[model samples]
Target chain A: SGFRKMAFPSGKVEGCMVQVTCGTTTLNGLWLDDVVYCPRHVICTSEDMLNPNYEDLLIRKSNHNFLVQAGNVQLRVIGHSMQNCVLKLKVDTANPKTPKYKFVRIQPGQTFSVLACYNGSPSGVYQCAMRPNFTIKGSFLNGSCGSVGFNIDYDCVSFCYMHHMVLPTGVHAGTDLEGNFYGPFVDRQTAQAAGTDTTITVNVLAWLYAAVINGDRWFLNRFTTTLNDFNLVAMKYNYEPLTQDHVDILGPLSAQTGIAVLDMCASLKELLQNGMNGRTILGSALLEDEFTPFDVVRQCSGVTF
Target chain B: SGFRKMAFPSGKVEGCMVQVTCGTTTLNGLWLDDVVYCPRHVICTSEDMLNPNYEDLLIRKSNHNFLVQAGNVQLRVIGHSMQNCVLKLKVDTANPKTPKYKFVRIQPGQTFSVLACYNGSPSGVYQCAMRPNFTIKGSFLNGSCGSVGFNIDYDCVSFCYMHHMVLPTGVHAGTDLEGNFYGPFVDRQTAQAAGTDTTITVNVLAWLYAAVINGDRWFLNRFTTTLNDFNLVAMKYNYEPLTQDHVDILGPLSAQTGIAVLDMCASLKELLQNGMNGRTILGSALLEDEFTPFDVVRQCSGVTF
Candidate 1:
């Protein structure tokens, strides 16, 4: 059975109209004459059709179903406000070269909605566009934008740019059995990054070791595999000198088993430093104290040189 | 010049006389009738002077002195209702065991003073006395008739009584590390008595050995000492077997440490218990937790066994 046709009362304005069309579309040069209309009166014949007044008009196709041609309607973009009346959008996609949709303009009060043009053939790059008089071209996708005049301010670039740069850092420094540390081997920033990585690795390894020690073998296996990258970093950055007490406590067992637990510590250290940037490491440092227990163990053991 | 001779009031009744003595000597008593009549007022005959009426006769020894033949007055005791009342008097001598004066019956509202007949000595113990009608022996001292009592209930005895007979039942049994136990060898009563001593020696050698195997020196010490004894007992009596995981974590440590640490644990337990009972242990449980690590270690190890 075919779908029933819907009817509306004459001259009834059903909110604002959004028009959609197949393939590429534009808002300018599209007349309201051929659009779907809520007329002032319907079925009035040619005499009534002579002055065809419309309360609202919508130009929409099944493939492209998002178009508004009526006045007093609005589209608002949420979570995009800035101190200087700017907007920032972060697009996370596997391929950033091309995007889906173009010239995405949000009215003052309306949310963005997909304007489907065809069945399963979606293609276009959605650009952040403003209204009133569209003249600006956004610098980059996944970037921030601020209001500007004809001249673009170069100094303002820093305010809207994001840098993903990293520097080399040293291995995490260690204290003597007595909680005293030797000086760093690298620059402050690099050392900070290394320290952070060291902290992350230590915690990750500790938990991993704890699971095994506590006989949660199943949980240990699952967690170790699930956090494989974290574990790798931990193993790479794990080098650390055992405190006297720690050595005293665990040494006998390790010696009996002929296993080198200290070697694991060294490996953990390296893994933690690999691929970790200065800022990333610094961020890790923010979390280091909360996550790491190396200092705790060393202090507890009363580790001296 | 020699000390001035002290004169007495003339015409005073013998019964109204006030005693006047110095050192160990008593002066003669004055007669009221002789003081009232002097030689100047004597009838003009020697027979009339010698035969003066006892009530009407009076004599004056000096300007302010008197001599009268007043009969002896009785000494009496008076006050609120008296029972087993006695009047003790001792004469002046090397050792006067018995009293010369005696007055058994005393009227409620009469007043009396001692009478002297050729008085010689004036040193003695003389006072009205009465035995207490109601027995008022306290927990300490005891004696008859105004003697102070001594302490009869010692601290140890009182504590024993309170713990064993007076304290509510089922309250003393508390939980311990293993689970719970009614007690080790000593109960609350015995513990209270032991608490009085410098140290309490509990016969829990067997339990101590068992606890060493279970990695529960904390519970073992509490059981031995008075501090947290109830909890120890409860735990011992209701102890459940350690789970496999718990055993895995604690078994190696117990095996490594032997039982020497238990001695220190026991001492600490006693000190803590005494402190708690005496209200000398202030601060919160968190502070206690921070200060004492043995209990925390046991808890963290999950040494249920």
Candidate 2:
């Protein structure tokens, strides 16, 4: 639509023989033709896919790494990309020569359940990483790796039981984020009896909120507060905080005002709300300055609101 | 701390007079003063009041506009500053021309309850923005506005209650993130039954995990999917995906282990696990392949363990 002479600090447009129109152009660069015209196209290079090293193209929230259990299958991976896309999975293992888990074709925001396995040996918790499948092979890339979606980890076994999921006797449970904890969930058998592979993360925000708005009863907040729940979760799984989107998908909300939390849970609950996992999952926000318990309400305002 | 001499460009140490010393310094310059000091300061210039526009003395997460409610006092503001120092509060208003909510003296990482007030009009929520309070005439800035702890927003009342607080009509029960439903808990008279003047923000990440992990029956992986959840939450707030740490605090986590979705959660959690908002509120390697929740099960092969 527009054109002008091109000039470099050292050379003039007429002297250097400019490629395309230079007077305010709208092209990735210049598409060569008989006229070498400017074109509209995205020119995403290596940096665009993700420099996993710098976390450039990736969206990560830091967290401790957790171990992966070796057997569960239904594990799912949801995509969060600007556009529907594809990804190549190159199972990274200690030995590249051994059998690995690799697949591709992931869509934006699409939930694809991983059907692989880690191991029963108690590993570093870091199961795998989701990366953007490369489109063009660059100088170093061979059409294999690219950026990342996020990493996935396994959950705490007994620790899951303790957060109400409760746990049996051990050096665990009572332990929290700073590396401390004791007394198992009230009682171990109680937690065991309550034990189930499924659990809901409570919104301590809700409970503290409950206390702040509706007022709390006795030891209610502490027993069920997500405020103190996550430390155990992380310590249970033995990892730091999560720098991933996986946590968002795996932890669902409760019957409270949670749509703001996730649309999927409401969907899942809808399909089974009449009996949402028996309305028996535990959910909560276990982060700093988050909810510690009913007490947080008073401490923050220095008095109950 | 250290020192050097000074000198002039064309003429040696002659042409100019330098304030500090340099060792055999030459080239363009004013050489003066004894023992050229190492340095008394770093000194940053104005617009550091976080001309947030200039990317000045501030570090921010992005967030959108939200409705702010009035009346309730003590809204907390945590610092994400570089120095363990001070800042002046300069509250902004629609009518800054009139009296406004401006004050300072807040320290880095310190959670200071917001002491401003909007009108009691009960309009859509949008309140004061916590800016780095400048120290005096603003010739130079002494510190920075590193981050934020949390924020509160009161949306169109109808929307908030309608979302799930349930309008008592429209779509009630059986409303999971979009599917599941319960009788709204033994009764609707519950939460609304004794609501108070104030409420605390809850994190959503907890609820979803309940089902996703503990073996959420089925049809779950879709709704609380997080893929859709975040898009809306991010949209609801307006602009920021949360440049301030508030997203981790206020937005909290989704029912889907969301804390890890953002790093701030873990920070606050750590500080609090040992102490909390009670204190007043504030990834991976790869697998060759990655983690196993996808199909994670115990099972490695080849070489080592």
Candidate 3:
């Protein structure tokens, strides 16, 4: 009957004192029932546990260290990230017989998803232990990390229901980079209906990136068509058009097609030259007239393709 | 009054009788107030008038033979088209002194816009005479024609109001391919609010195409982001993803960026090989595994640029 006793105080929000022991540590923290209230990038270990039984877990911020052990608790990754490898769950197989634990290492960006799996064995989705009694399931869908963080937007009905669910209203329906069919993700009706605790927020641009970059024809057509429609609408109303992001993910694709990517507009280059805070500033080609709009022969340089 | 007399029989729907003289041809046709009811590729001569005073003019079908002359009556084109040069109003300079007329010629594909103009001029938007009393003012938002036709969806408010209008809900706001700001063009509230006579149907895909393809970063970022969000949502709900259009306008952009374009998925090629009625069939590279996903070093072939 040997056990270490200690007191862990809570922050300003509330006060809580707990006891601890050798193989386990009872840390003072809140058991957030909702992902909205959960703190991001919280180190998950045997000493400190972030209420693992919650339906959804929103892991945000930078640098997450996961050292918890538990059984499989099914869940889904419900959001997006700019980078790839949002959550790298490497199973420590050093001691084959010893308790196998999945080492969770998050990339440096924001990632949101219901699925979490081991990076080494990316057969499908995997379940990771968040605590002794809590674990989640699912796979990566537009997940990324590195110079960013991760996010889990919602906790829905069942794994099957959430997996095979179609968007309500179907405002945005098309294909993904992998030639898969995709519908609008920001439908209020669907989000409200699927959200477990309450309604959740949806990231439209992130969703668009995943869908458009995955496939060839559908994505390109949809992107250009959408652009054309937008410009048409703007021209109809005679409103100012959107400035292209110089470092846009589609830049290489557009450039390759002989379509104007870096040279589509003069503002991005000018803005970049002037040291303005813009997305296109990261691009290599900041010159003008280098590539004509939709011109197949001539294209701008400095862009990776 | 010297006018030419002629007997124009009704093709169908109904019949009409009329009288004529010299100088002008007294023809028979329908005076469609709404563009929706107007016949496409109608010969707009002094003989037949398609209700010039109508707020909206929907000119559709094949080749258009315009021989009408009128003054400038400002109007906005409210739709989109795949090709450029939706309506070419060539000012027949050969007889410039004999009453300058803006000769109207449509491209092959379907074009939609409030603005109509001459292709050779490539100047700002122009107003073409539909009849002695009918004329439309504005520029091409997105008007095209080719192996296809053109469409003028809606006619709305004043030039000033429509010219400087912003999307109602601003769902699709961002920069265009030309690096200009754009918003959602298919807002029901705005469309309903702007329609002169009744509500109008907005082509979301077309609008999205224009909006996303015109800019550099904004468009690409927006496109990829949207796709990602969609897939993220889909994965959360466990739904089938969207299929990327093979000949998508954004394909080149995505491809050039080292992201998967035509090679992202295998279904498009497979579908094309199977002779299925799909869009990717128009693409040149129908092979698979040749280009890795997001591989800048390797990409699919047969696609233009």
Candidate 4:
């Protein structure tokens, strides 16, 4: 089962670190499976597969124009075919050691998700994605780059075959991601692993708050769907920093009219969105402010909210 | 300036206290200005106005059915005439010795607030009320009270009047709380140099929240006005008690939603309401079950109002 080492040039499992030793010896840079890419033209050794300084080396030697030009995929399955096909949801969990993940078979029109983790950690959320315009049987070590990478069943020469590998390369796959793969990727992103925007809840709330702070009044007034409360702010995240403008304008009018006091409440709300997948994405001081959630009450304190 | 010590029958300022030193003596008991009888009867020495053990005393000797049948007020001035008057927002803050207060003239039709502590203490919110039926003339005093006492205006009849009165009772002087006076003696009660509702907010938030916990669904369902999104927690001051039904149903939901979050949250809110004025009107614990400030968020935590 040494053939258990199969890394496709499709999507990546976020928060996952694949530590593979080159030639089973060199301790390389940790391979962050954030985006999928082509394999080594010479050999997909453990070092080439997952290693320290892999990116640095990738930048030095494999820094070929084709690498960047060819590997624009964060996650995808290159369709190596003239034949269109259906993507699938397969749980190839028989190999306890490898826990195989077969995701390079997506179509602009299809997608799927498996609940099992290939690295075999006690189940939790991991990053995943979908990309298109994968070139099939093209030039990546995996043999493709375009809407669809390599859908081997369509064209695989037995002699040049990699175990369990089907899609061949250097062939144009499916459609464009602008509306095709991208649409599906975004739509289906969280459905399986992080669906419901649960992972980025803080981010979503921050974005919504940003709109209020940026004073996108007209935009705030717009409703995306009537059901989501007509996209109306029924209850306010009512942070003071978030409402200073409205408060300044309202003045004493805010007294009985009521304004739930929000002194130090908004500071963290905006900052909460800066991280995802265990990685902190710092924002600008302009974007991050301050706030506290304590006795900063102004409710019925003369005004109302 | 001796025309300002008359007590109106219609309204009583919530946090005001009257300190009148009767026979020139400070007996000290809670002072309640009421029109249980006709005007300016002698003994204006608070002993006759409203004071110590008045309730107990009234319960005893003067236990006249007149007192009980007469004083059913939470705090008030029963409109002497529906001529419906304007409750002015006046501030007669002068006389370093007696800074009075007043705020029963609420907007049942017309009401605003004026804060003054006759004893000159650091400022804080004290005294608050919603008399079942109170007139709105609003004014104050605080000192010894026996109800048969001082009435600079009324002669303890069989008695006469005047002096030691640095407080200048019934003086038609105009205002600042420092001791501004414009009166018929119907406006205040200051037994001289002192006195004041170190309590009542608990009931406010409690009543407001009771309306929520009782889940008087039908009433709650009744849409009064659609303002904020559609929270519709508008109809307030409604408290019933935790229903076995909701608790039973929510038992599981709460298991997940978290209960420590509220049952206790509710208890504190009622207390929050109690503080704004230094008093505590605990809930029946029967009608108002616990909940979150998402509403009860007492105007102050720990208080019910």
Candidate 5:
């Protein structure tokens, strides 16, 4: 008795039936043993051939190159002997312009599936070969197929998730004393330091203007508010108050001050999103002007005394 | 003409007024014509001494170090040769617990200022010396005067200009296939391969699901709506519809009846967000169940003729 042949439509044999038989007897133990089908050219040699020299045969038949076309391909290996035997299939399409093929592992005695798709343009004939025996007999049963029958077309549709407004990456969590999310630093510190000094000038002229317009008492109140606000926020985030060190590094030296607080905040936000944290102090534009200064101080100054 | 003497609350300095200079200048030019203030200890023998080496003799005999117990100290260099002379000053405190003295730089030929605020603490002795010439020195220059004073403190602060977003490094700004912003893939191949397999499964499943739920004509309309919605979103961002390769790889497997359409959508969304766009996909819980078979097919089908 021998294994029975099986058929499939879309190269799918998931529920296909198979018949198993024993030599010289119609055995009651008959069942579908395994169905491993290789494309016509994939199997190189007869299963009965033993100890065939695969490598030597390859060297001798170098011109008989193996190839497979992209389409429905199958390998049906059935029998009690098929249970212990390992099936290795190789598809060579080194010439990328031609249709390519790949061999997939299939379980013995059970129906398994494989897919062959065209990878490159100018589809040509593809050859499939299978090595039934694992021995040196590189001998394989082989066949050829083409991709012309497969209706292949290309379309490009894509989708992505969206958000309403861009928020600071980690702002939903918390911010540091410098209004920065803790992460990695992206910009080069040496470059930033070279361009901007950290010195902080009292802005005597600004103070004078405030005092003259708002009166001495009001000016003092505003100054105190600003300082208190800054200190409160810094303390909450476990940071030192804005010190002379910060001033010396970011002070206004001339009439045309180079510092722009809002731009600095935006840049810092972008960097934080990218993963730069703790390496540099980010300035808050929210600290600018009297209104901003008052709001920040009032919210942050939780100190009772 | 000889230099005149100017007096302050802390000390008196005798020096000639000099013009100010700006920008990066060499040291030699700074000393020749500039009137710099130097104390008695800062003056040295001229180069024209009877014996060239004779100037060395005056330096050894002068016992250049002198101690003065005072609240503040000051020195003035009177000659045009002031820039050539180097001055050194050391403040000493007998009581280690209470440290005294802070140094500040003065502009060339500008008035030197010193401030001391002693809260009932005793004063210490300070010494001023000139290198190479020990004969020239000054002691008790400001000791006899009252304590110096200042109103403001100086400080330094740093500012960082970077944003905090959980974005992959080097994200380019562009409109994604959903009319939303998205980061491109790390490489070109990944971008090209996006959604190919998944889209095929989705399209075919839309048809199958429509056939099962609604009749053929109704299914076609529903499928058209689904495809149109999907394509509309894709076209808004300049993306094409699903390709043949996508349908081949994903169509058969997805049509096998194990996975639901929304599950496929969620998985695809996950891949696009984490794998392609490098963004965190949110609101899955809300959007997960919105589209049933009818809705999904309607949204995924392309425009009808």
Candidate 6:
């Protein structure tokens, strides 16, 4: 096996695989075959590549940013262009140590394909994921922020990338920059690590709450629950505060009226912008003074987001 | 002059002035010049009058319900007829001990009168107090819960009897039972006692909040202030918790959107009643699920009311 050497900006003979030390932890960035395993915190260690068109193998960075060639990236990370790797979905798991993520690469102007393997070709073609609730925000398909109503003609089960990190800046990603994995992830470590220990639970409720509060339109549009469910969860959040037992009653409910409530906040914003001159937004009247809805939205966002 | 003798049902020789011991205090029910002064807690001691036609004088009760006679009545308290002594107002005062209250007795089918003396005829006829904010709930005139838009033709300065205790039981009082005194109560003891003390403060904000929460139509209709003002005060209540200084910033604001928020609550109730099939009430859209508004109204009421 021949070791292809790489050089940094300082002209140092840095190995393709380097043991980079960040604070207390040392990440073993290994170079095997043609693929480079850049562990967590090992970002930006490798400088510009010797060959700009050296596209042959895997350039994997586990949960951290990996620069295939930095300025001249030819390695396909999120998309085929390497230059336009714009769509991605972040996978959240309790196993923070093991970053297990899969990418579904859809060809330009094509519907998103449901791929089985990380580097595997499209196993099944399906229409891209679209949320009716969030269609108001924009389209998630066509790589733009918009969507179509659910179509039974195309395969419905698929993941939409929500704001996943791809290298190279100045890229206008999703329409609203809210592209997260909206489907199930089969992680061996996720299940293995979470074996019955309730203490280290992933607060997906809070995560979803934060998402809505953060005004992730994609999440808002695509989230499955209804507004009433979100109201229940929020009630628990307000009254129960720290009681998870009460919170877990409807863990998934957190994602609901979050979108619904946002509609309220959005309408309120409109009311405020219009100087609150009008007494109604949508169909609800402005019984409260101008400040109530504002403060409500503020408190809601501050608490959850 | 001569002392006229009055007899109780039990044939006890009730003197012109009788001292009755109740709890730790003694209340004096004095009878003078055909009038009777019934102090607090001294109600119901007198029996049916010996003479039903005896109608020459003053009958005063200090915040307590007074009955000139149990069955056959002839004395005028709030109104001319002892039986239909309707339209009265409860004046809240710091001087709980010295229960000094003025009565403005309006004749049946007549506008409210601003009287200089308790039992005096109308010194000046006033159109009666009406709150525009609370107008939707109803009026405070005609002893029924209805009101006219402000009028400058007759005097506009007058007190409307809220749910003050005018007795003989089973009488259809105001349209709604929410006719409290709306005008200023002239109390000598109130100003003197509250001169420098902060500990014995009257929570009028809480009272107003309770009124709105309790759905006092008159209070709601007649309460002043915009919804925005209430929102600011509610925000203070939610964040500051127990800081009155924070609450006092807009003490009057509490009464504002209380009515405004009620409109929301009322619309929400309608939504719930209509099964929330539609997405809009008034002008606000139903973004949150059915329960959010319900829970919101509930929590808001529970906290402040």
Among all windows of ten consecutive residues in candidate 3 chain A, which has the lowest summed lDDT? Answer: A1-10
Clashes of 3: 168
True contacts kept of each: 0.00, 0.01, 0.00, 0.00, 0.00, 0.03
TM-score of 1: 0.13
Looking at candidate 1 chain B, the ten consecutive residues that score lowest on lDDT are: B156-165
Instruction: TM-score chain B for all models.
Output: 0.14, 0.15, 0.21, 0.22, 0.16, 0.17
After superposing candidate 4 on the true structure, give the runs of residues whose Cα lies further than 4 Å from its correct spot: A1-305, B1-22, B25-104, B107-128, B133-284, B288-305
Candidate maximizing lDDT = 6
Could you give candidate 5's per-residue lDDT for residues B217-300 as a string of tens digits?
Answer: 211121222344444543443233533443443443346444444444334333333332322112111111112232233222
Candidate 2, residue A111: Cα displacement in angstroms equals 35
TM for every model, in the order presented, reads: 0.13, 0.17, 0.17, 0.17, 0.15, 0.16
The Cα local distance difference test for each model comes to 0.21, 0.19, 0.20, 0.22, 0.20, 0.24
TM-score of candidate 5 chain B vs. the reference? 0.16
Chain A TM-score, each candidate:
0.16, 0.16, 0.21, 0.18, 0.15, 0.17
Judged by TM-score relative to the true structure, which candidate is superior, 1 or 2? 2
Q: List each candidate's DockQ score.
A: 0.00, 0.02, 0.01, 0.01, 0.01, 0.02
Residue B261, candidate 5: Cα error in Å is 9.8
Best by TM-score: 3
User: Fnat for model 5?
Assistant: 0.00
Worst 10-residue lDDT window for candidate 4 chain B reads: B1-10
**lDDT tens digits by residue: candidate 5, A214-272:** 22221122112244545454454332345444334223321123323222223322432
Ranking by lDDT: 6, 4, 1, 5, 3, 2
Question: Which residues of candidate 1, in runs, are more than 4 Å off?
Answer: A1-181, A184-197, A200-207, A216-218, A221-228, A231-305, B1-305
